[PDB]
């Protein structure tokens, strides 16, 4: 569907014996909207849950380099007198430094709207692939019409850097957004923490300390206010564990957590407060179950030790012989078991062998029952949310099958080694990185799969609940008994929100011709016998003629393991001397344009005397010499580029070819680039409504039908000998 929202393609596919992968294609028409087009796929049996992706449709050409706009810190302290110092790192796609000129502007993102700071516009040089600029503090206060520093907190800062090459043949706009203005470099979150505690037990605060953009913090000491001895440290997952002691009385626990970073003042420490309620026993019978898991982070294959601990009177003891444990993973029961508890054991330990089907997290729900406590049946439960380290269920690694001591060349056969599960179907793509320069979002990653899974779980609250029915409801369970104890009513699908020398004819140059923006759309099967469960496939791919970095992304799809998105493998293709033909996207017919051939020379010591040549194409008009081809001799200094201009007047509509061949004097090399460009006539794409009609067969027409005659299009400003597309839309008007 288009950015208007109407579906322009509808397809019915079946994934039967395809091993879960459905490849599809769609040709974009030339008469087309521009913007964020969307793909919406859904299952037939569940036609209201829609899985969507987005792709931009835009008229572009591929850039030759990337621009990274990195501020020195990922936030902005409002009392920092040095301002916001950012660094512009312009790097070529084949891994070379960029000499150029950056125009850097700043602005305040205030919610959904943004305002610029026009006095903050700076023009800086970029030498050796880097440049530095500082937005001053006083420019930021006088740019904002509101007074004081304190109202800038909450609003974000964005920086747009537009980098011009020194030849001027290419520019890249890159925007770094979402730099918040904060009074504290950290943020305290209680989201992985239970909101319910057992009174008389330790309460394990699982405090999530974050950077203010949303990234997890690391090695940040936090402490409960009033309990200075409990000073923990933030681990690599961003969350620190603080086990405090709770008094045995039914009161709400007010927990205030502050950071204890040594290099900040007391006003820069992030605090947050939580009211945690006590677990409610039935009949205030003082029977609690405590579920102690001494966890930091778990790889699969290791083990943890669940500590069941009873808290009840001895007059009813030796009536508890087991604790039932259940594992909830991905919204369904993974493993249910009993743990035998001999009488006299206040604490028992159950070893959970964390296998690979515990990814991404699980909920250990445990309970027991007791009949003779006060004459009626009593169910006492607990639950804990344990986070496994999120990885693939199987594995998929794409790397170089060859030695890769050499740098690859355009057209060179390259050996790709794919290591995965046995029998998995591996699908691949190899994408030019300038596509990721233009549009970076909506990429398939493994973490996106696990947050799709993590947002579709049925457990609401981590840890315990209000009572046993609260524990089972927040875990995502219904417990029902014959006596009458049951979980409360769940009826909502979501969780509730809380001249001569012809050097070009002598060297028989075949031209670099294939420049795809994406290739290697291949389907492979790992049918090799596995070595320790890993099948290795070698592939002989042929590299395309673009001088860039190809990003190769492979997804393995296995019957016993599942979907694993690999890490992207980067193949950098680069020569020492080459041609970059900087054609535009489209050229208006019968107008004069100038195109650029940027010859790059990357020798460390020697300059190059390069004979360059535009081949004569009869579709373009150019200068007609006695020799029909147009050649000259340039000199390129070492580690540098030179832009050669060519003026052409195109005369024919369509995909015309431009060929530039160059050969180095006194050296046995050459290059040649043949690229096609679109030549459009002089008009402008402009839509015109043929009709809007209301269909009603019982009110309009006769005999139960209604005949509507679509007229032909009444365009009089149309360009002659050009294509037009008439779009028909029928829509069902809802009635109430």
């Amino acid at each position: 569907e288009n950015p208007e929202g109407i579906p322009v393609k509808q397809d019915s596919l079946s994934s039967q014996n395809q091993l879960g992968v459905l490849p599809l294609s769609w040709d974009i028409p030339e008469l087309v909207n521009m913007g964020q087009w969307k793909i919406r796929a859904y299952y037939e049996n569940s036609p209201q849950q829609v899985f969507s992706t987005e792709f931009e449709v835009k008229e572009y050409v591929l850039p030759s380099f990337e621009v990274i706009v990195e501020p020195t810190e990922k936030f902005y302290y409002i009392y920092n007198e040095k301002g916001l110092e950012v660094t512009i790192t312009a790097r070529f796609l084949y891994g070379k430094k960029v000499e150029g000129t950056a125009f850097v502007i700043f602005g305040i993102q205030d919610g959904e709207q943004r305002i610029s700071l026009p006095e903050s516009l700076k023009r800086i040089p970029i030498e050796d692939g880097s440049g530095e600029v500082v937005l001053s503090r006083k420019v930021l206060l006088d740019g904002v019409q509101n007074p004081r520093a304190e109202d800038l907190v909450g609003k974000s800062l964005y920086v747009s850097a537009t980098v011009i090459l020194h030849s001027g043949s290419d520019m890249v706009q890159a925007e770094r957004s979402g730099i918040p203005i904060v009074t504290s470099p950290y943020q305290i979150h209680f989201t992985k923490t239970p909101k319910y505690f057992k009174p008389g037990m330790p309460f394990d605060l699982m405090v999530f300390v974050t950077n203010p953009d949303g990234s997890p913090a690391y090695r940040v000491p936090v402490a409960v206010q009033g309990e200075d001895t409990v000073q923990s440290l933030t681990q690599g997952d961003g969350v620190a564990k603080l086990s405090i002691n709770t008094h045995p009385s039914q009161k709400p626990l007010s927990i205030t957590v502050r950071t204890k970073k040594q290099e900040l003042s007391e006003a820069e420490q992030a605090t947050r407060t939580m009211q945690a309620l006590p677990y409610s026993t039935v009949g205030n019978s003082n029977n609690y179950l405590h579920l102690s898991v001494l966890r930091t982070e778990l790889r699969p294959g290791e083990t943890l030790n669940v500590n069941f601990l009873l808290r009840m009177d001895r007059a009813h003891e030796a009536k508890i012989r087991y604790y039932t444990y259940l594992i909830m993973n991905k919204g369904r029961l993974l493993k249910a078991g009993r743990q035998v508890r001999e009488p006299g054991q206040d604490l028992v330990v159950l070893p959970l062998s964390i296998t690979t089907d515990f990814i991404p997290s699980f909920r250990l729900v445990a309970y027991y029952t007791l009949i003779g406590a006060s004459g009626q049946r009593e169910v006492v439960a607990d639950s804990v949310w344990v986070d496994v380290k999120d990885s693939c269920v199987g594995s998929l690694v794409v790397k170089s099958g060859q030695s890769e001591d050499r740098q690859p060349v355009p057209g060179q056969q390259m050996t790709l080694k794919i290591e995965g599960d046995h029998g998995a179907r591996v699908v691949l793509v190899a994408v030019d990185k300038g596509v990721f320069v233009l549009n970076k979002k909506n990429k398939l990653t493994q973490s996106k799969i696990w947050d799709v899974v993590e947002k579709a779980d049925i457990g609401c609250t981590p840890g315990s609940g209000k009572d046993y029915a609260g524990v089972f409801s927040d875990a995502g369970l219904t417990f029902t008994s014959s006596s009458g104890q049951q979980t409360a009513q769940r009826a909502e699908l979501q969780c509730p929100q809380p001249l001569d020398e012809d050097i070009i004819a002598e060297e028989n140059i075949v031209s670099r011709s294939e420049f795809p923006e994406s290739w290697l759309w291949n389907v492979e099967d790992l049918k090799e016998p596995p070595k320790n469960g890993i099948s290795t496939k070698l592939m002989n791919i042929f590299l395309k003629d673009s001088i860039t970095t190809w990003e190769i992304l492979a997804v393995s799809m296995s019957d016993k393991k599942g979907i694993c998105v690999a890490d992207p493998f980067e193949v950098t293709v680069m020569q020492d001397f080459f041609i970059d033909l900087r054609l535009p996207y489209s050229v208006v017919r019968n107008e004069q344009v100038e195109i650029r051939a940027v010859l790059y020379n990357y020798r460390q010591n020697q300059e190059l005397k390069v004979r360059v040549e535009l081949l004569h194409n009869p579709a373009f008009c150019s200068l007609a010499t006695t020799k029909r081809r147009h050649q000259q001799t340039v000199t390129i200094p070492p580690k540098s580029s030179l832009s050669v201009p060519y003026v052409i007047v195109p005369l024919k509509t369509g995909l015309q070819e431009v060929e530039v061949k160059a050969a180095v004097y006194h050296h046995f090399i050459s290059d040649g680039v043949r690229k096609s460009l679109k030549v459009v006539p002089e008009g402008i794409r402009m839509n015109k409504t043929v009709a809007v009609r209301t269909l009603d067969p019982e009110r309009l027409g006769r005999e139960g039908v209604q005949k509507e005659d679509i007229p032909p299009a009444d365009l009089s400003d149309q360009v002659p000998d050009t294509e037009s597309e008439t779009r028909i839309l029928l829509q069902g008007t809802p009635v109430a």
Partner: nanobody, 123 residues
């Protein structure tokens, strides 16, 4: 990487002719330059000839200009050097070398080398 052998050396009379064969194990079609380098007894390993990827560009040294001819055949990866009108100062060990085309008249970029044939012209 390639393996590179040379065949066709030996005893040659003065004013005669010689033909050799530089045989490459692998693919010749990605090698920008191959050259013939001779080595006199008691002297350097200096440049004699080199040929382009397409065979359209030849470079010879100054002493060998009107008398030597280098050819390349990419069908079966074979580079041939032909002498007419031998002088007795061409008594040398001849090696064939593969390089990436950068400065093809110097040996410092020819990465892959052979073992060479002894060519003795008698006067």
């Amino acid at each position: 990487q390639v393996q590179l052998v040379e065949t066709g050396g030996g005893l040659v009379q003065a004013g005669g002719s010689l033909r050799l064969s530089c045989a490459a194990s692998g693919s010749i079609f990605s090698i920008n330059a191959m050259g013939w380098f001779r080595q006199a007894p008691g002297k350097e390993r200096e440049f004699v000839a080199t040929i382009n990827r397409s065979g359209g560009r030849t470079y010879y040294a100054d002493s060998v200009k009107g008398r030597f001819t280098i050819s390349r055949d990419n069908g079966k990866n074979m580079v041939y050097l032909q002498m007419h009108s031998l002088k007795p100062e061409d008594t040398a060990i001849y090696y064939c070398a593969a390089g990436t085309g950068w400065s093809p008249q110097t040996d410092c970029e020819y990465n892959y080398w052979g073992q060479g044939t002894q060519v003795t012209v008698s006067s």
